[PDB]
């Protein structure tokens, strides 16, 4: 991992206070998206 | 090609700056923090008389805990601490890597939970609390490591100027540390290893068990014997004033300087609940209750 | 003797000596040690002034 | 106003210049006297016929440790911690003042410290035979030549070491004034440097009471006209001296300490002096509401003829 | 033991240090030479006269130091007289050893007068030694320092806002262009100075420092150190010495 | 400490065993409850 | 090749360190823990 | 195994196992383990921490005899275990940590170790200190 | 000169403690029936 | 099981306070995922 | 228990005019514990 290869803070937003269940939440979102991408063939 | 006269002038300037900063910070913060800690355990209200039976009402402790529980339920509730997020796909491959790295460094390497708990519980009574991170370069089979030494830092071992309101515009910032003689020998006086010697009162009064100015059993000649060193960050033109106001980190011992270098950012961070605009220190639960 | 700990009558003490001996003595030999040698066999040498 | 002002004179250079070392007994000891003399001629006639050698082994030296209490009595807010820190600073100042005094260790035992057979037999049963532990001071360990009962005599030079003739303790003789001014001669510290070089001390530090720095300050000047300052368009009036080099090539750094006796000057060295401690400062209380401190400390010196002392007075 | 390691290697290093100190003192001292061999048939006829045939005592054995005259004036019996001016070298005429008086200074300030050094240098120049080194003991370097102090004002030091003070002098330049360096030795008679030369004047060892020992009589731990070093000079009229002012 | 150090626990164990032996002896000995 | 003098010095240092640590920890923790345990069963109020 | 606080001794200048310079833990180990490391010819090496324990309850007395013979190898004996960060060697060397295990006036084992196997619980912790709070002091 | 190095004996040892060894009701009054 | 073959703490997150029924929970999740993977043939 | 100092060993010292010498030099010592621990019983016809 080259340090010069990393970006700067100008393009890196940060977030804190993440709930434990958020992972599962994401999963749900993902599967939802899955159905969506299954309905569109383009 | 650093001259010794330059270093002597720097020592004099830094000594007077530390004197002023201490004279200010003492009556600014510690005079209140000591009594706040005393009220924490209800030891300040004295038994004026035997027949009075002055049963103390532990109220500050109660609010402190009521706030600390929610604080930890906010940040430390999740299995992870944070997670970086980007705005484009060209830099998303680095977000997850940085997130994993910082999480490992903070939790799987350091006791981030204890650090946060200490920075919180001590902040709401001391009006502030500090956290710090350095580059650990320990070495002994001569394995050498480069770690991110993150650690809590009390407010009793900090000294700052009065005209400052944030780390950005801070002109002078000192932090006494207790480091073994090994690290000092790694940078100065190899032939001499016998360089012996409010900040202690406030600490020994946060509780009533510890006494930092005692001997836990370490021999003075033992290289691992901990010794007080003075670390400072100063914005000043120690060179020709015509030069830019460069920031410099200095690390010295008693009447001896060990390290000097340039740096454009203070690795210290401060917590400021109920902050006070135009000032470097916020409020505290003590002053409210 | 958990009742009272006394010090003058302490038997079987440990002198606590120091594992070092200051043998300071003036011995430098600045130049005379850095002259050289002209090893010989007999003891009646000369130099033919 | 929510603060207090405290002068807090806390120079304490000596304590930080000598380090410290823990022990496991109230009485420590070392052993070092000297190397054998030169004897001059050592010719031989092809035969030894010795006399079991003239080794004359080292002498065993010891020192005692004392006690400091500095009790606290409570009958600013929390004044307890304030008075505690104040008393801590006071005991540190007292230690800095004592360790540089001219005290001499005095106790029932002089050279038979062990006496495991007797060891004050009349002690148990009554426990009220408590004597007063007094430790050895600076001027006592620096090859003294006497002591006025419990204080080192300030008018008698020390003896000579058999290794090489050197008198590391001499009575100053200011040959400049007709015994009117109490001050170092211009060539009285250089004599000490010569003696130390002959004995091989390697000291490079000199503590001095501010009541004598004027002497070294004026030493840079004179009246005969052979020494004078200059100022080539300089906006400075530096009047100070912090380094000396005798003709022998021995550098010496000067430092000032207000906790020294006015009628004396010391020649220190980092490693040659060590601070032995047995009981660290502990905040506690007596037997079964007061607070107190108790610090057991002793003084150790590698070799007497290493460090040097010089008394300032007129002969009489 | 508690501070000692052994009673043999410790004592052996002790005796080695002592023998080195003894050599250092003996070379630079008044160790008058005392020999019994008054050889007459030398110069390619090496033999010992009838005397010293069977006897095995051979007490007198010394060397060096004036008796080993080394271009001195005269000695009084078994002691070197530090009051005799050397002879005049017929080559050019030069005395390499003399005794200045303490009349220019008080009658209790034993020492030089700042003029004897240059006189010795000129004598060496006339002799052609080219010496450039000085071996002097303490109590005399203060003269080298304060030569620029005991004046009327002609010479003077300077201190330009400098906190350092110095009375050290380890080099001087003779008016003849001869540079001399000062080196302090402690095994001197504390009454003289030696204008010796460089390593060209070397010694020689017959029996190098080596250990021997006898086996046993009933019980003991005997050992020996029997080095047999010897000294040598070169054209004694080359180098020179200067005693101090004592009086007679 | 110089000689041994930590004499308090030694003395305390000694006194404990002493009172144990004393209790045994006095209990096996006869004496009235004079009060 | 551990010397016995080294071990003696270590014993002395460790003994003094243990003495200091005990002198501290006693009044720091145990003086309170004893009475806390006594209150646990309600045996302290006489 | 659990470990009470009555059999622990630590320095004052420490606030966590990391920066802890000295850490002692008295243990009660049989003579077997000691014979496995020292004095095989001698097995008769007999001898607040007891008060606090016997007062946690009012039934036990750790300084009593449960019936074990003193000569019996399984006779439990008090040993002193210590973890110390110090340059027992030349101070110029790094401040190495060392585990020592000793008996009365006798050392049995010494070794290096870079981690203390002990863990502590700290409910209502107190920043800048090695000890937290307790329900007693609150109630 | 004269190095023997046979008399260090810097033991500086301490004592070893080789000594020898020779080793619920509530109220104040209790009663029983017979 | 070779000790050198194991990873380090830097790459090992830890979790505590696990409910007994969590197993069943996982099972549910699994079967849910099953249905999902049954709907997508890619 | 005993107190052997170094060891019992045999060795030769410096010889003489066709002699041959040898020595042993055995050095030991006793160590009793609790003097009041071992019994002694003399035999006497009377006092």
């Amino acid at each position: 991992v080259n340090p010069k290869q990393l970006p700067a803070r100008h393009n890196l937003q940060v977030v804190v206070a993440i709930s434990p269940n958020e992972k599962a939440e994401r999963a749900q979102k993902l599967i939802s998206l899955k159905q969506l991408i299954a309905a569109d063939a383009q | 090609k650093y001259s010794e006269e330059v270093l002597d002038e720097l020592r004099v300037d830094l000594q007077r700056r530390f004197n002023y900063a201490q004279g200010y910070v003492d009556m600014a913060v510690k005079g209140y923090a000591r009594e706040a800690w005393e009220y924490f355990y209800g030891n300040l209200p004295a038994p004026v008389t035997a027949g009075s039976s002055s049963w103390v009402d532990r109220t500050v402790w109660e609010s402190v805990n009521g706030t600390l529980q929610d604080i930890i339920n906010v940040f430390c509730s999740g299995d992870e601490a944070v997670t970086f997020v980007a705005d484009n796909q060209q830099d998303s491959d680095a977000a997850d890597v940085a997130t994993k790295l910082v999480n490992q460094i903070l939790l799987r390497d350091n006791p981030g939970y204890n650090i946060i708990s200490s920075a919180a519980q001590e902040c709401l009574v001391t009006r502030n609390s500090f956290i710090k991170y350095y580059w650990d370069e320990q070495t002994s089979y001569e394995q050498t490591v480069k770690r991110v030494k993150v650690e809590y830092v009390p407010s009793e071992q900090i000294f700052v100027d009065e005209h400052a309101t944030s780390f950005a515009d801070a002109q002078y910032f000192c932090h006494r540390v207790r480091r073994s003689k090994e690290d000092l020998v790694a940078m100065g006086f190899p032939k001499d290893e016998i360089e012996a010697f409010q900040s202690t009162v406030a600490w020994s009064r946060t509780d009533w068990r510890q006494d930092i100015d005692a001997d836990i059993g370490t021999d003075t000649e033992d290289i691992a014997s901990m010794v007080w060193v003075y670390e400072h960050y100063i914005r000043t033109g120690v060179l020709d004033k015509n030069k830019e106001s460069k920031l410099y980190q200095v690390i010295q011992a008693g009447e001896h300087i060990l390290h000097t270098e340039e740096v454009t950012h203070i690795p210290f961070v401060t917590f400021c609940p109920y902050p006070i605009p135009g000032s470097f220190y916020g409020q505290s639960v003590y002053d409210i209750t | 003797n958990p009742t009272l700990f006394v010090s003058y009558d302490q038997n079987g003490k440990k002198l606590s000596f120091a594992n070092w001996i200051s043998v300071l003595s003036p011995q430098d030999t600045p130049f005379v040690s850095m002259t050289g040698k002209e090893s010989i066999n007999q003891t009646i040498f000369s130099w033919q002034t | 106003a929510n603060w207090i002002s405290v002068l807090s004179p806390q120079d304490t250079p000596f304590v930080s210049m000598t380090g410290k070392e823990s022990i496991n007994q109230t009485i420590f000891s070392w052993q070092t006297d000297a190397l054998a003399s030169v004897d001059g001629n050592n010719a031989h006639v092809e035969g030894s016929r010795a006399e079991d050698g003239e080794m004359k082994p080292t002498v065993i030296k010891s020192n005692v440790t004392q006690i400091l209490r500095k009790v606290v009595r409570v009958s600013r807010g929390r004044e307890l911690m304030y008075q505690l820190e104040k008393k801590g600073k006071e005991i540190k100042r007292d230690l800095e003042k004592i360790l540089l005094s001219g005290q001499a260790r005095t106790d029932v035992l002089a050279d038979q410290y062990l006496t495991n057979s007797a060891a004050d037999p009349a002690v148990a049963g009554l426990n009220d035979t408590h004597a007063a532990r007094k430790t050895g001071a600076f001027q006592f360990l620096c090859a003294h030549g006497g002591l006025a009962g419990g204080v080192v005599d300030k008018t008698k030079n020390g003896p000579a070491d058999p290794d090489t003739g050197a008198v590391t303790v001499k009575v100053a003789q200011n040959a400049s004034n007709p015994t009117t001014n109490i001050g170092f001669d211009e060539a009285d510290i250089f004599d000490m440097t010569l003696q130390l070089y002959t004995a091989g001390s390697e000291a490079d530090i000199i503590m001095i009471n501010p009541a004598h720095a004027k002497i070294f300050a004026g030493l840079q000047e004179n009246t005969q006209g052979s020494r004078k300052r200059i100022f080539e368009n300089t906006k400075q009036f530096i009047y100070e001296v912090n380094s000396i080099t005798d003709p022998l090539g021995q550098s010496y750094k000067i430092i000032v300490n207000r906790w020294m006796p006015t009628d004396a000057v010391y020649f220190f060295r980092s490693a040659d002096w060590t601070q032995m401690v047995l009981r660290a400062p502990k905040r506690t209380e007596l037997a079964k509401e007061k607070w107190m401190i108790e610090m057991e400390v002793g003084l150790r010196h590698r070799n007497p003829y290493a460090s040097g002392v010089l008394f300032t007075a007129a002969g009489k | 033991n508690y501070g000692r390691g052994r009673e043999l290697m410790y004592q052996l290093e002790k005796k080695g240090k002592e023998i080195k100190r003894d050599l250092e003192k003996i070379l630079l001292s008044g160790q008058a030479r005392t020999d019994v061999l008054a050889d007459q048939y030398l110069t390619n006829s090496a033999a010992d006269p009838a005397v010293a045939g069977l006897n095995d005592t051979h007490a007198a054995r010394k060397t060096g130091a004036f008796q080993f005259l080394c271009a001195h004036g005269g000695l009084a019996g078994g002691v070197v007289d530090k009051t005799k001016n050397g002879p005049a070298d017929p080559d050019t005429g030069a005395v390499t050893v003399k005794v200045a008086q303490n009349a220019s200074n008080p009658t209790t300030n034993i020492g030089f007068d700042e003029a004897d050094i240059f006189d010795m240098t000129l004598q060496l120049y006339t002799a052609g030694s080219e010496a450039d080194i000085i071996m002097i003991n303490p109590a005399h370097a203060k003269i080298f320092a304060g030569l620029q102090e005991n004046t009327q004002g002609s010479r003077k030091r300077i201190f330009e806002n400098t906190k350092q003070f110095i009375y050290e002098v380890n080099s001087i330049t003779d008016p003849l262009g001869q540079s001399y360096k000062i080196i302090v030795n402690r095994w001197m008679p504390t009454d003289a100075v030696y204008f010796f030369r460089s390593a060209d004047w070397t010694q020689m060892v017959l029996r190098a420092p080596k250990r021997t020992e006898l086996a046993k009589d009933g019980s003991y731990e005997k050992w020996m150190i029997e080095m047999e070093v010897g000294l040598r000079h070169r054209n004694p009229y080359a180098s020179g010495v200067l005693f101090t002012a004592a009086g007679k």
Side-chain angles (χ1 to χ4, degrees), chain A, chain B, chain C, chain D, chain E:
Chain A
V1 193
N2 284 115
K4 206 160 192 163
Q5 182 170 355
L6 279 71
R9 300 178 293 93
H10 294 71
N11 316 323
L12 281 178
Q13 174 162 14
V14 56
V15 53
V16 195
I18 51 173
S19 174
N21 70 337
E22 64 92 18
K23 301 288 188 183
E25 211 62 11
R26 278 175 63 90
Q28 286 181 359
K29 296 171 180 178
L30 262 64
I31 55 170
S32 181
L33 302 164
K34 184 165 163 62
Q35 299 296 317
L36 177 138
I37 180 166
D40 186 349
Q42 179 170 339
Chain B
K1 291 163 67 65
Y2 292 82
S3 177
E4 311 323 299
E5 190 277 331
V6 171
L7 269 47
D8 187 73
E9 178 61 17
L10 183 63
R11 276 203 301 274
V12 172
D13 182 71
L14 174 142
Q15 183 176 358
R16 62 167 56 190
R17 292 273 207 73
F18 173 83
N19 291 126
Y20 286 120
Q22 175 184 143
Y24 155 76
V25 169
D26 288 328
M27 293 184 174
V29 174
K30 302 180 178 181
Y32 308 106
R34 191 180 64 83
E35 56 190 7
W37 273 120
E38 284 186 354
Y39 277 137
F40 195 68
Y41 304 83
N43 297 128
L44 193 151
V48 298
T49 305
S52 87
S53 294
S54 55
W55 178 93
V56 183
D57 183 6
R58 293 277 290 287
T59 63
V60 186
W61 185 89
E62 192 175 354
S63 296
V64 169
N65 296 119
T67 55
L68 196 79
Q69 59 183 5
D70 284 338
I71 287 282
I72 62 174
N73 182 39
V74 159
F75 301 87
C76 199
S77 169
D79 52 17
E80 273 187 22
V82 312
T83 185
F84 300 109
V85 74
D87 43 17
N88 314 98
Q89 188 271 346
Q90 292 84 26
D91 47 359
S92 55
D93 283 18
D96 46 358
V97 187
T99 292
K100 298 284 181 57
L101 262 293
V102 299
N103 297 134
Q104 185 195 151
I105 290 158
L106 194 70
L107 301 173
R108 296 175 79 170
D109 190 5
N110 296 252
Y113 167 68
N114 296 336
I115 308 312
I116 292 157
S117 315
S118 305
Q121 76 185 142
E122 189 266 4
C123 178
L124 280 68
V125 305
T126 53
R127 207 183 313 286
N128 277 115
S129 185
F130 302 99
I131 301 163
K132 177 258 279 177
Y133 49 85
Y134 284 161
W135 266 105
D136 194 19
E137 306 293 82
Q138 294 315 89
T139 179
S140 90
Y141 183 62
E142 63 194 19
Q143 278 287 358
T144 307
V145 290
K146 300 174 178 174
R147 281 171 58 267
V148 192
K149 189 201 196 181
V150 172
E151 61 196 296
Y152 163 92
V153 168
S155 198
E156 319 300 359
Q157 293 188 135
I158 296 292
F159 294 86
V160 192
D161 57 353
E162 169 170 6
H163 295 186
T165 191
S166 70
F167 290 105
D169 56 338
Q171 293 183 327
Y172 169 59
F173 182 94
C174 167
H175 163 59
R176 294 236 295 170
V177 195
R178 286 164 52 79
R179 296 271 290 282
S180 62
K181 314 213 189 203
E182 182 172 350
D183 303 334
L184 317 188
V185 167
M187 298 187 289
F189 36 83
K191 273 183 201 193
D192 297 331
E193 278 66 60
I194 314 304
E195 193 272 326
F197 58 87
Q198 48 270 37
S199 182
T200 70
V201 163
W203 190 231
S204 162
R205 298 290 171 275
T206 58
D207 47 354
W208 279 100
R209 296 83 160 283
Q210 188 166 128
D211 185 3
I212 203 71
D213 200 72
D215 184 2
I216 308 168
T218 60
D219 194 3
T220 185
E221 292 87 2
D222 175 73
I223 186 167
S225 178
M226 216 67 69
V227 179
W228 298 277
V229 306
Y230 314 80
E231 174 168 359
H232 314 262
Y233 300 160
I234 170 161
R235 294 175 172 278
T236 194
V238 68
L239 279 59
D240 300 329
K241 214 71 169 177
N242 67 338
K243 293 141 182 172
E244 182 174 330
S245 277
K246 279 187 169 182
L247 195 153
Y248 285 99
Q249 160 175 242
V250 180
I251 297 160
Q252 62 170 18
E255 205 170 29
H256 278 75
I257 291 162
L258 276 295
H259 178 45
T260 60
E261 57 173 0
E262 173 168 357
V263 65
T264 183
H265 172 46
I266 298 174
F268 293 73
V269 176
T270 193
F271 289 4
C272 204
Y274 307 98
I276 299 164
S279 58
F280 190 83
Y281 302 77
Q283 294 182 354
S284 182
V285 177
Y286 156 77
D287 303 71
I288 297 161
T289 55
Chain C
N1 289 325
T3 290
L4 182 138
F5 271 98
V6 59
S7 313
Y8 285 156
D9 199 73
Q10 188 64 256
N11 188 278
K13 293 184 287 175
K14 312 168 191 64
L15 284 75
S16 181
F17 278 126
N19 49 14
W20 53 256
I21 306 293
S22 178
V23 73
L24 76 168
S25 54
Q27 50 103 31
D28 184 18
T29 74
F31 186 24
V32 179
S33 46
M34 222 175 269
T35 54
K37 296 288 154 291
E38 184 39 79
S39 88
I40 51 168
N41 314 267
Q42 291 288 0
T43 179
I44 319 175
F45 63 91
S46 64
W47 45 86
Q48 294 193 354
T49 300
Chain D
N2 222 23
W3 54 263
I4 56 173
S5 176
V6 194
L7 294 166
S8 164
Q10 293 296 67
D11 304 336
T12 52
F14 162 91
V15 184
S16 183
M17 280 293 183
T18 48
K20 31 180 180 178
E21 176 176 4
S22 299
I23 50 176
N24 305 327
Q25 203 72 17
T26 52
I27 290 165
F28 51 85
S29 301
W30 62 99
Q31 57 184 359
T32 177
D33 167 67
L35 189 51
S37 68
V38 179
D39 186 48
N41 168 34
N42 314 127
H44 275 257
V45 300
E46 310 183 346
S48 59
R49 322 304 180 276
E51 69 196 40
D52 203 80
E54 197 187 348
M55 311 194 307
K56 300 288 145 50
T58 177
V59 302
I60 311 174
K61 289 169 180 167
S62 298
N63 193 342
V64 186
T65 72
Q66 58 172 351
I67 298 167
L68 288 84
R69 195 71 59 76
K70 305 307 299 301
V71 179
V72 177
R73 162 58 200 169
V74 54
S75 185
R76 60 206 182 187
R78 277 67 182 176
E79 65 83 21
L80 183 150
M81 297 183 288
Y82 155 83
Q83 274 204 269
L84 196 69
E85 296 182 11
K86 167 173 159 182
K87 292 291 193 175
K89 291 187 191 305
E90 278 196 5
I91 183 170
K92 286 180 186 178
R93 294 190 320 166
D94 290 356
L95 184 76
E96 177 71 349
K97 175 58 147 52
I98 292 164
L99 294 186
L100 311 192
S101 61
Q103 297 173 346
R105 60 171 201 75
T106 184
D107 187 59
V108 58
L109 295 154
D111 61 6
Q112 298 270 88
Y113 48 88
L114 273 155
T115 57
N116 310 94
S117 283
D120 295 337
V123 60
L126 53 85
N127 295 115
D128 281 18
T129 188
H130 306 280
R133 293 284 178 73
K134 184 61 68 66
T135 187
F138 182 69
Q139 303 173 210
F140 178 80
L141 293 163
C142 284
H144 65 270
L147 73 171
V151 176
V152 180
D153 201 72
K154 300 164 283 183
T155 71
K156 293 160 67 181
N157 56 11
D161 52 313
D163 192 341
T164 58
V167 183
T168 307
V169 182
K170 311 180 75 176
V171 191
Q173 304 179 355
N174 182 10
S176 292
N177 274 49
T179 78
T180 55
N181 289 85
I182 300 168
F184 314 152
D185 207 325
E186 270 64 359
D188 197 0
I189 65 175
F190 296 109
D191 199 359
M192 179 61 74
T193 60
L194 262 62
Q195 298 291 2
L196 293 179
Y197 167 84
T198 51
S201 176
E202 312 196 300
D204 63 69
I205 300 175
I206 306 185
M207 301 186 65
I208 180 175
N209 182 343
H212 301 297
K214 184 208 77 57
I215 306 306
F216 290 170
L219 188 134
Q220 211 163 33
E221 296 172 8
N222 58 6
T223 295
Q224 58 188 331
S226 306
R227 307 181 288 189
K228 46 176 69 180
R229 313 179 184 275
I230 56 164
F231 315 99
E232 176 178 356
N233 290 275
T234 68
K235 302 167 178 292
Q236 305 196 31
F237 186 65
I238 302 184
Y239 192 65
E240 183 184 11
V241 190
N242 69 335
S243 314
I244 302 179
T245 60
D246 55 339
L248 308 177
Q250 303 188 137
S251 187
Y252 284 107
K253 178 177 284 294
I254 300 167
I255 61 183
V256 183
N257 169 265
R258 67 188 67 182
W259 298 123
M260 284 160 43
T262 299
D263 313 298
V265 75
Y266 302 145
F267 294 75
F268 282 93
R269 192 179 186 278
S270 83
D272 290 3
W273 283 90
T274 309
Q275 187 181 238
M276 325 314 286
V277 168
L278 198 150
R279 285 196 261 274
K282 286 285 185 184
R283 50 182 179 176
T284 183
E285 181 177 348
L286 208 59
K288 309 183 180 69
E289 312 321 327
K290 305 176 192 179
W291 282 75
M292 49 170 286
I293 294 87
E294 194 275 350
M295 185 178 185
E296 185 72 26
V297 64
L299 184 58
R300 190 178 70 167
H301 181 52
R302 166 165 148 274
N303 181 90
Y305 299 108
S307 300
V309 299
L310 184 66
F311 313 112
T312 313
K316 198 178 189 300
Chain E
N1 281 80
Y2 51 89
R4 317 161 204 174
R6 320 173 184 270
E7 186 175 1
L8 282 168
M9 193 171 186
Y10 179 41
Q11 306 293 354
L12 200 75
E13 186 50 80
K14 231 179 192 182
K15 297 283 168 189
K17 300 271 185 66
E18 295 153 23
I19 214 72
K20 280 209 285 284
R21 290 174 56 187
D22 299 335
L23 177 154
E24 270 275 10
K25 180 191 173 192
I26 283 160
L27 297 194
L28 316 192
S29 50
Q31 189 68 258
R33 175 159 71 90
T34 52
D35 213 38
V36 299
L37 271 286
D39 51 356
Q40 68 281 14
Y41 282 158
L42 218 65
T43 70
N44 198 262
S45 163
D48 196 333
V51 66
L54 280 75
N55 56 268
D56 52 318
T57 67
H58 298 116
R61 277 198 66 72
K62 298 184 176 57
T63 180
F66 314 156
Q67 205 91 338
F68 205 108
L69 46 91
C70 193
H72 90 288
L75 76 167
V79 55
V80 187
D81 194 317
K82 317 202 181 302
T83 77
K84 295 295 193 302
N85 297 264
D89 194 333
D91 191 308
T92 80
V95 181
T96 51
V97 61
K98 65 177 75 65
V99 186
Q101 190 152 310
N102 47 32
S104 181
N105 289 318
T107 192
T108 179
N109 178 349
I110 312 309
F112 316 150
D113 59 357
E114 190 262 331
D116 297 328
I117 303 301
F118 303 125
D119 185 8
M120 286 288 295
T121 61
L122 195 152
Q123 296 280 337
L124 297 173
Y125 178 83
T126 45
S129 169
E130 302 186 330
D132 280 311
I133 302 180
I134 292 164
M135 269 80 84
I136 189 169
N137 66 94
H140 298 295
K142 56 178 175 60
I143 310 306
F144 286 67
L147 57 81
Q148 61 194 270
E149 286 315 289
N150 70 336
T151 68
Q152 64 271 15
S154 179
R155 305 172 187 171
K156 65 182 186 178
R157 325 190 81 94
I158 299 294
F159 297 102
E160 181 171 349
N161 294 321
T162 176
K163 303 178 174 179
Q164 303 89 16
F165 194 93
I166 298 177
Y167 278 163
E168 194 191 350
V169 176
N170 63 1
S171 295
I172 46 170
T173 310
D174 206 59
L176 310 188
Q178 305 188 237
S179 159
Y180 288 80
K181 282 147 67 175
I182 303 94
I183 296 89
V184 188
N185 281 17
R186 53 173 61 81
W187 312 114
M188 321 203 71
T190 189
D191 63 65
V193 60
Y194 293 169
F195 284 83
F196 194 75
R197 218 178 167 280
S198 301
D200 214 318
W201 300 38
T202 314
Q203 57 269 16
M204 61 199 67
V205 52
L206 196 147
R207 301 196 195 199
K210 186 173 70 62
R211 289 90 163 91
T212 78
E213 73 205 61
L214 260 64
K216 72 209 170 191
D217 193 18
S219 60
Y220 48 63
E221 53 175 20
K222 277 169 73 73
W223 277 90
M224 301 177 192
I225 311 183
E226 58 94 22
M227 77 205 301
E228 204 165 346
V229 191
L231 185 58
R232 185 199 76 185
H233 284 79
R234 167 159 184 175
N235 188 272
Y237 287 68
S239 72
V241 299
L242 163 55
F243 307 108
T244 190
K248 184 69 72 175

